[PDB]
Design a protein around this ligand. Structure first.
Ligand code: 71N
Lengths: 218, 1052
């Protein structure tokens, strides 16, 4: 083996092979036992060698020491600074998900509110047209029959009804433009999450760099 | 000098929008003012604005709008009011005609304060009590009626099979079978007892008490018997009447004839709640008895006259709704006839929210799936990066169309460039009618949303996002001149026998034996059973997959191995799968605890799943169903299509068994707001509500109650925040005194246990607790006739704010441990208090009287001079309750309960136990509350920790009043309980591994993927031997306590 499962699966996360202990060892998810000691090419030379050659249905080894970007003391804070970036970035990441969540539920509340508006209007438009049948079926008289004891106060109903409708359509209008800025704000939060994601992934990866070199603060 | 004088300019205190989930009676406003202006629109065209009361009925506002229309024009053109009905737009945004005019204005959910008058359109007005169903479901029924998708229309119409069948079963032996539906007996799965229970009986006898009520009724009568634990209710009914009627004027012969007549006219009811002993079981098999045995209680039953019970049960009377080669298909082409590889055209994402600057490039990634993948992931080329991106490419997937297994799915996403995913979606490659999909499809995408760094996400839900305002992604599915279908069972069996016979005559040599005679090797024949017993997450090597796959025909003798076998099959081989299908056909049944694994997210195949359903159909008892109902409901999410075997199985048991039904209803309803499952679950709820009979009206009270409590607590958490508790409490009582509250919160069944009735509110004892989420502590009169023998006052907690459903699971796991332990000899008394999520971060939590946190204990005993708390205060407090022969048992309980909880909290890895996490009852039982993050989510920042660390405090109580308490024999016997308990759970490890896996379907951030469950493997140590695990447990227990845990065992 030449020294010079749960965590092997977790470190294989986000990689589009490596050797592990238990057969006695395991090449890794697609698991390959090393039982297949007691063979040609003392363990390590079989790994360099490589996959269709025996299995019908079958380049990137992972053991970088990560000095790529010498103290022990000073590298200990290079976690404490990167992890505070990571955690302050993480804090900001999941801060916006609350906003992403709250806004999206707020958004869908608005269109379902607008559907109630639209529908409410259709009852009020239908109501002004209800009287013009039943009012001008009895506008038959017009001027006589004790002057205008009927037809003056009928016009007041019609006046409020129409000015009421006026206010409803204004209220909806107001909500619809409320929704627009909200739609744009929603999109804008998602936008900055996507730029944060790979910064947050690289920061979490580079936090793993200064961890695995070393092998209180946090 | 503190901060090197460095100013923070960015900082500012005013609203820092920086708290350091969240409508009511009208739109935008929670509580409508007590008098309100309500526009009333008529057939006249006159909009007469009434000022009515918030809490006034429609009867009232009608019979006042009748009178005040006599003051407005066009009066004789208004008909008699008795020929009219109200209607308005609600907040859900529909025209809700208002039939039950006893309803109050505040309960209508009106959006805008107005009414319209109309006549009863649809004169079958009793039919338009779909309203009931809509209220119960939490969306309108007519919203389903206008759904295009035929699958939905087909689900609604075809699922009535089960409803009608199930209603027939209820009225088979009526009214008995109706009472079995309504009041199913509440009994354990084993009829025999564990030995520690038996030994509280002097050679198997319980002292019971039967109660009777003869006129004037005013009086009741003990009849204390002493009968066998295993005798049935029929017998106990007899001996109870023997005693009643025994006399100096009855002979022995004349007694027995009186007994026989009276016997078959009564049944047994538990006193103080609506439980009932309705069939032949041993008395001790019923849970109430077995509770009474253990708790040290004398069962109080009651002779209920069958007349007066069959008097209470109403006719269910289900009725069907308005929804009531030889075809144009011509089975046009079988899938296996087609000659090309799969290819799928991806073209144009309408929009994506990305920065032009920060992100370099983007592309649509794809792959075909079956849970885990049957070919290389096919990325599409980069185009028009971060700015109106469209493609027009076909990706060519290396799998020949005939190989595609029945449950194959396209899984796609859209990624960045240094890679991260932007949006995602999946599609069933076959539609619900076995048809291989063709034409163009519009796949609206989901967000990732959180966590999930993986690019593709196939464990997520299939189908498009029903939010239109998302990344859409148009795509064309290849068309093979004619409509394609998956082959019939005839076709597949034929091909099986072919490749089976084609095996038989193959050569001497074949890459040795790479994937494959009847020469039954004896070292190998033991290797199968060794693999058979491994845990579901013990990742298998492809050497073992071939090994297994080769002896597939042998594996049928070890039926338990099937989950391992099925994962070993190649699903991109039409050949291998066809043979597997035929094994699964004949395969003999397995234990329900294993069959459940075959309904998790790794086994999508309909045949596999149908098997699993048949295991459960034969083997799973109604008891064990209602234990595991949560998982089975969450596993519907992973089903491909709406209509399926598992939904039919659950809908039937829900309509068989009103105890199941109740939780089956709530468990759907609680996840209803979650739009991903919303449609599947609603249609199911619609089918249940349509078929369950009068219970629908009981549920509607429960729902109507919950809404009031949701609405009340919202007002407390916004607005009436930043007000003294004294102010909040003046508001709380004022509001519960209101008449709509009194209506809604008084006559109903506790959702935590529908057995327990809730009668009148004792406002006296109702209060807003100290927690910041403003939970309400509620308290109702038990309106039972024998309330005295159980509890004069039922009280439970309603908490709007926390997501209960984590607690809900850990308590479920705790209960399942307690039961494993109990029936395996070990008495470790846990207290899994009742908890129920009933909506998005809203629920109910059972109170446990005479219990207090260690913090409260320490404040009573805490000496007036505020220097330091003594650790003995707990031990002294416990003595002050428990004095005499009592005392020793009170320790036994503590020690037993502490141990049980020590093991479970370690294993589950629940949140750190401190003093306000742990509670102690007066009788000396210990139990944990508020568990928090369960599989150790708290490691995601920077192990294998012991969350229940035994302070000095507990150790004293464990060892009686002691100096050097870790050396006592009291502490040894405690240590042995932990060692026996830890092993016991480990020996049943499979169940817990599966139980957690099945719960990946829910949105809980502590169960995102199988690697989150992995913790539980470590902590039970299954990759090691049981003697190593023990020593691992001892090690880890030694680590936390600083010494104590160095021991050895005699028995292996
Ligand atoms: N005790 C008991 C438990 C479950 C049962 N299922 C059936 C049915 F016949 F399948 F309905 N009968 C049962 C009796």
């Amino acid at each position: 083996s030449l020294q010079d499962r749960e965590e092997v699966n977790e470190k294989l996360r986000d990689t589009a092979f490596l050797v592990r202990d238990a057969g006695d060892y395991t090449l890794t998810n697609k698991l390959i036992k090393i039982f297949h000691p007691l063979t040609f090419s003392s363990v390590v030379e079989l790994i360099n060698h490589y996959l269709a050659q025996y299995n019908p249905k079958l380049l990137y080894p992972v053991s970088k020491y990560q000095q790529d970007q010498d103290n022990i003391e000073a590298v200990g804070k290079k976690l404490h600074e990167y992890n505070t970036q990571f955690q302050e970035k993480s804090r900001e990441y999941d801060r916006l998900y609350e906003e992403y969540t709250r806004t999206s539920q707020e958004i869908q509340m608005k269109r379902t509110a607008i559907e109630a508006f639209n529908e409410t209007i259709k009852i009020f438009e239908e109501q002004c047209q209800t009287q013009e049948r039943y009012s001008k079926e009895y506008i038959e008289k017009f001027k006589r029959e004790g002057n205008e004891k009927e037809i003056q106060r009928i016009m007041h109903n019609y006046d409020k009804l129409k000015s009421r409708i006026s206010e409803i359509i204004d209220s909806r209008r107001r909500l619809e433009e409320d929704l627009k800025k909200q739609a744009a704000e929603y999109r804008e939060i998602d936008k900055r999450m996507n730029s944060i994601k790979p910064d947050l992934i690289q920061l979490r990866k580079t936090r793993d760099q200064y961890l695995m070199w070393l092998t209180e603060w946090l | 000098s503190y901060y090197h004088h460095h100013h923070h300019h960015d900082y500012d205190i005013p609203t820092t929008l920086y708290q350091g989930p969240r409508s009511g009676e009208l739109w935008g406003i929670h509580l409508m003012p007590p008098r309100i202006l309500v526009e009333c629109l008529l057939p006249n065209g006159m909009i007469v604005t009434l000022e009515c009361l918030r809490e006034a009925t429609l009867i009232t506002i009608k019979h006042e709008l009748f009178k005040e229309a006599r003051k407005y024009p066009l009066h004789q053109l208004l008909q008699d009011e008795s020929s009219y009905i109200f209607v308005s737009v609600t907040q859900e945004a529909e025209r809700e005609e208002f039939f039950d005019e006893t309803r109050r204005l505040c309960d209508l959910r009106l959006f805008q304060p107005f009414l319209k008058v109309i006549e009863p359109v649809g004169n079958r007005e009793e039919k338009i009590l779909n309203r009931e169903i809509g209220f119960a479901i939490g969306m309108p029924v007519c919203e389903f009626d206008m759904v295009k998708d035929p699958e939905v229309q087909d689900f609604r119409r075809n699922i009535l099979n089960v409803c009608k069948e199930a209603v027939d079963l209820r009225d088979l032996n009526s009214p008995h079978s109706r009472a079995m539906y309504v009041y199913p007996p509440n009994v354990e799965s084993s009829p025999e007892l564990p030995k520690h229970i038996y030994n509280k009986l002097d050679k198997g006898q319980i002292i019971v008490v039967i109660w009777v009520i003869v006129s004037p009724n005013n009086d009741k009568q003990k009849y204390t018997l002493k009968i066998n634990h295993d005798c049935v209710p029929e017998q106990v009914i007899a001996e109870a009447i023997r005693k009643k009627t025994r006399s100096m004027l009855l002979s022995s012969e004349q007694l027995k004839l009186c007994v026989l007549e009276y016997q078959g006219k009564y049944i047994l009811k538990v006193c103080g709640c609506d439980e009932y002993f309705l069939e032949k079981y041993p008395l001790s098999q019923y849970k109430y008895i077995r509770s009474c045995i253990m708790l040290g209680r004398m069962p109080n039953l009651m002779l209920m006259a069958k007349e007066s019970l069959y008097s209470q049960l109403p006719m269910d009377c289900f009725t069907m709704p308005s929804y009531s080669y030889m075809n144009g298909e011509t089975s046009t082409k079988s899938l296996w006839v087609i000659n090309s590889a799969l290819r799928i055209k991806i073209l144009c994402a309408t929009y994506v929210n990305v920065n032009i600057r920060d992100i370099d490039k983007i592309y649509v990634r794809t792959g075909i799936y079956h849970g885990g993948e049957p070919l290389c992931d096919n990325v599409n080329t980069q185009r028009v990066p971060c700015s109106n991106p469209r493609w027009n490419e076909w990706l060519n997937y290396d799998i020949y169309i005939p190989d595609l297994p029945r449950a194959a799915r396209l899984c796609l996403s859209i990624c960045s460039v240094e890679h991260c995913p932007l949006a995602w979606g999946n599609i069933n490659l076959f539609d619900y009618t076995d048809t291989l999909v063709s034409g163009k499809m519009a796949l609206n995408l989901w967000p990732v949303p959180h966590g999930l760094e993986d690019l593709l996400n196939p464990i997520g839900v299939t189908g498009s996002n029903p939010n239109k305002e998302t990344p859409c992604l148009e795509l064309e599915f290849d068309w093979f001149s004619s409509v394609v279908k998956f082959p019939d069972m005839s076709v597949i069996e034929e091909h099986a026998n072919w490749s089976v016979s084609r095996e038989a005559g193959f050569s001497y040599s074949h890459a040795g034996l790479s994937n494959r005679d009847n020469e039954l090797r004896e070292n190998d024949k033991e290797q199968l059973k060794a693999i058979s017993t491994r845990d579901p997450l013990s990742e298998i090597t492809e050497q073992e997959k071939d090994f297994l796959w080769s002896h597939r025909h042998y594996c049928v003798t070890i039926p338990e191995i099937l989950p391992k076998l099925l994962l070993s099959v190649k699903w991109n081989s039409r050949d291998e799968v066809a043979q597997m299908y035929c094994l699964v056909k004949d395969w003999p049944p397995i234990k329900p605890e294993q069959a459940m694994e075959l309904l998790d997210c790794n086994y999508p195949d309909p045949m596999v799943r149908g098997f699993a359903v048949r295991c459960l159909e034969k083997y799973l008892t109604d008891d064990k169903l209602s234990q595991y109902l949560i998982q089975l409901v969450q596993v519907l999410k992973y089903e491909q299509y709406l209509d399926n075997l598992l939904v039919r199985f659950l809908l039937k048991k829900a309509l068989t068994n009103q105890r199941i039904g109740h939780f089956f209803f709530w468990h759907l309803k609680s996840e209803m707001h979650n739009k991903t499952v919303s449609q599947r679950f609603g249609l199911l709820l619609e089918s249940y509500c349509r078929a369950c009979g009068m219970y629908l009206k009981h549920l509607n009270r429960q729902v109507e109650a919950m809404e009031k409590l949701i609405n009340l607590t919202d007002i407390l958490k916004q607005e009436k925040k930043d007000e003294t508790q004294k102010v909040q409490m003046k508001f709380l009582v004022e509001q519960m005194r209101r008449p709509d509250f009194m209506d809604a919160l008084q006559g109903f069944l506790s959702p935590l246990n529908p057995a327990h009735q809730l009668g009148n509110l004792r406002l006296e004892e109702c209060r807003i607790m100290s927690s910041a989420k403003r939970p309400l502590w509620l308290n109702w009169e038990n309106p039972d006739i024998m309330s005295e023998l159980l509890f004069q006052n039922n009280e439970i907690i309603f908490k709007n704010g926390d997501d209960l459903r984590q607690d809900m699971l850990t308590l479920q796991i705790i209960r399942i441990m307690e039961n494993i332990w109990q029936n395996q000899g070990l008495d470790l008394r846990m207290l899994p208090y009742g908890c129920l999520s009933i909506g998005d971060c809203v629920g109910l939590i059972e109170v446990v009287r005479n219990s207090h946190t260690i913090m409260q204990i320490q404040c009573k005993g805490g000496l007036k001079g505020a220097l330091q708390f003594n650790s003995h205060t707990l031990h002294q407090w416990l003595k002050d309750k428990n004095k005499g022969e009592i005392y020793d048992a009170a320790i036994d309980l503590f020690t037993r309960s502490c141990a049980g909880y020590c093991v479970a909290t370690f294993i589950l890895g629940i949140g750190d136990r401190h003093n306000s996490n742990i509670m102690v009852k007066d009788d000396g039982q210990l139990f944990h509350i508020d568990f928090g993050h369960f599989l150790d989510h708290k490691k995601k920042k920077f192990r294998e920790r012991v969350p229940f660390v035994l302070t000095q405090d507990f150790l004293i109580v464990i060892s009686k009043g002691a100096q050097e308490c870790t050396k006592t024999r009291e502490f040894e016997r405690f240590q042995e309980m932990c060692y026996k308990a830890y092993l016991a759970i480990r020996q049943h490890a499979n169940l817990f591994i599966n139980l957690f896996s099945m719960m990946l379907g829910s949105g809980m951030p502590e169960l995102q993927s199988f690697d989150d469950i992995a913790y539980i493997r470590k902590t039970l140590a299954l990759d090691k031997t049981e003697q190593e695990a023990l020593e691992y447990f001892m090690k880890q227990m030694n680590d936390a306590h600083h010494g104590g845990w160095t021991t050895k065992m005699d028995w292996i």
